Amino acid sequence: MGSSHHHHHHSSGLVPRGSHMKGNKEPRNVRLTFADIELDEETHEVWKAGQPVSLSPTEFTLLRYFVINAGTVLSKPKILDHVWRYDFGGDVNVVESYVSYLRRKIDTGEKRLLHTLRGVGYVLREPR
């Protein structure tokens, strides 16, 4: 809620009286994808190589963050503070439990897209 909106920097063109003809502000809903992973922020659903998984809000946020930062080595404590940022009250052992369950619900194929750097954390990366 504000009055800003209309930016005071419209050095781009100068004929909004028409411009488009229908609208192109956005293509379609917000859907995240990765290697063989699909997430719909609209239907809050997940899909992996023809393998759908019913994850909960928390577990969903975790997977989503992993994808957003896919390629960057994440840390156990960092990941916690990042997610638990919506509900404090979870030791560092709670993450391990969730991670183990996640692996079982996300790991299965011969292609390991989740590398575990024991002592540091985990990193998302496609098989090379």
Method underlying the structure: NMR
Q: What is the DSSP string of 28-64?
A: SS-EEEETTEEEETTTTEEEETTEEE---HHHHHHHH
Question: Per the structure block, which two tokens stand in for 89?
Answer: 């009250």
Which domains occur in the chain, in start order?
A: 1-128 (1.10.10.10)
**Separation of alpha carbons 84 and 55, rounded Å:** 16
* Largest distance between two CA atoms of the chain: 59
> Which value, to the nearest 10 degrees, does the dihedral of the CA atoms of residues 41, 43, 45, 49 take?
-90
